[PDB]
Design goal:
- This is DNA cross-link repair 1A protein.
- Belongs to the DNA repair metallo-beta-lactamase (DRMBL) family.
- It is found in: Nucleus.
- Binds constitutively to TP53BP1. Binds CDC27, which is itself a component of the anaphase promoting complex (APC). Binds PIAS1.
- This protein has eight helices and 18 strands.
- It is of the alpha/beta class and 341 residues long.
- The strands form three sheets. Strands 13-12-14-11-15-17-16 form a seven-stranded mixed sheet, with helices on both faces. It has a six-stranded mixed sheet with strand order 6-7-8-9-10-18. It has a five-stranded mixed sheet with strand order 1-2-3-4-5.
- Helix 3 runs parallel beside helix 4.
- It binds nickel (II) ion.
- The site of nickel (II) ion has 4 residues, from loops.
Length: 341
């Protein structure tokens, strides 16, 4: 059944709750972003109102074939009324079209639902500055102090420098970058820009990127693989056997592959700086795992929460085990006692 942490009290609203059939009492289904664990259950057969960003609405219409009459896109940073309740959608700094949602309850309570987010100090000057938040529904994916990672800017600098060096030393090297969802588009875009190539990809993935309102996208991507030296492949294919195979397919145009797997956190973060990361190599294939995250580090999450000072926190991630739930509740209490709220 629908878990309590997907229900917004005092409304007829649910958040990222599409895989439980008709939720008893739900008059509007909000969708925070287009990632499969969140939209799971949506299709062309859905006949309830869906509220979301413009970009998520593009993906719903073109990828899932949801009928236009049920898609209700809202602008960001704009006070809107939905079934008699004031809401605002805010940038979540996650993947394209991802939003946090502010609900202003008729009784006077204010609820923020982060969806998935990578907390940033820029949020401290959004519309959130302007009033008090009583209840926070929080993306706790990385809520433990072992989870450090570098800025997105440092990671892209490493990737650009690595790729440019490799291809300038060998003009017959091909660059490959893995993907299995929207998000992390900067990694392949920034690499293609430094090399003066378009990024080449399958028709299905090109279709996906063309829904994301990225400016000048027609100049940056293509379905003609032959004309491109940065290829995107399914994440599953980013291994020595799948890459060797791919190399055969390029018909002797290339004699070397340099590949990137943008992961989330991995345990080598707890020892190694970005400046010191190395690849796994077999023959003329090298695979780099780079810690490009679109979730909050432990320190970023903690800063956000200590700034916001909510009265109650409801985790939405890692809620399935008692050990995880108890660990999270300990950190919450530490933070409250240190900051004084
Ligand atoms: Ni996500």
């Amino acid at each position: 059944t629908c878990p309590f942490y997907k229900k917004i009290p005092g409304t007829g609203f649910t958040v990222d709750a599409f895989q439980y059939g008709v939720v008893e009492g739900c008059t509007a289904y909000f969708l925070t972003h287009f990632h499969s664990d969140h939209y799971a259950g949506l299709s062309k057969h859905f006949t309830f109102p869906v509220y979301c960003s413009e970009i998520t609405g593009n993906l719903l219409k073109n990828k899932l074939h949801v009928q236009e009459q049920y898609i209700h896109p809202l602008p960001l940073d704009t006070e809107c009324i939905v079934n008699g309740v004031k809401v605002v959608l805010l940038d979540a700094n996650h993947c394209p079209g991802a939003v946090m949602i502010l609900f202003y309850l008729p009784n006077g309570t204010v609820i923020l639902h982060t969806g998935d987010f990578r907390a940033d100090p820029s949020m401290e000057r959004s519309l959130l500055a302007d009033q008090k938040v009583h209840m926070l529904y929080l993306d706790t994916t990385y809520c433990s102090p072992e989870y450090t990672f570098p800025s997105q800017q440092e990671v892209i600098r490493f990737a650009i420098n690595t790729a440019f060096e490799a291809v300038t030393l060998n003009p017959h090297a091909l660059v490959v970058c893995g993907t299995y969802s929207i998000g992390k588009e900067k990694v392949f875009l920034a690499i293609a820009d430094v090399l003066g190539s378009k990024v080449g990809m399958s028709q299905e993935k090109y279709k996906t990127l063309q829904c994301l309102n990225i400016p000048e996208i027609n100049s940056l991507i293509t379905t003609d693989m032959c004309s491109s030296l940065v290829h995107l492949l399914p994440m599953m294919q980013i291994n020595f056997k799948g890459l060797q195979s791919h190399l055969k397919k390029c018909g002797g145009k290339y004699n070397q592959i340099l590949a990137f797997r943008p992961t989330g956190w991995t345990h080598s973060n707890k020892f190694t700086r970005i400046a010191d990361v190395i690849p796994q190599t077999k023959g003329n294939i090298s695979i780099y795992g780079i810690p490009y995250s679109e979730h909050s580090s432990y320190l970023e999450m903690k800063r956000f929460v200590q700034w916001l000072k909510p009265q109650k926190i409801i985790p939405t991630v890692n809620v399935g085990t008692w050990k995880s739930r108890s660990t999270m509740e300990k950190y919450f209490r530490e933070w409250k006692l240190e900051a004084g709220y």
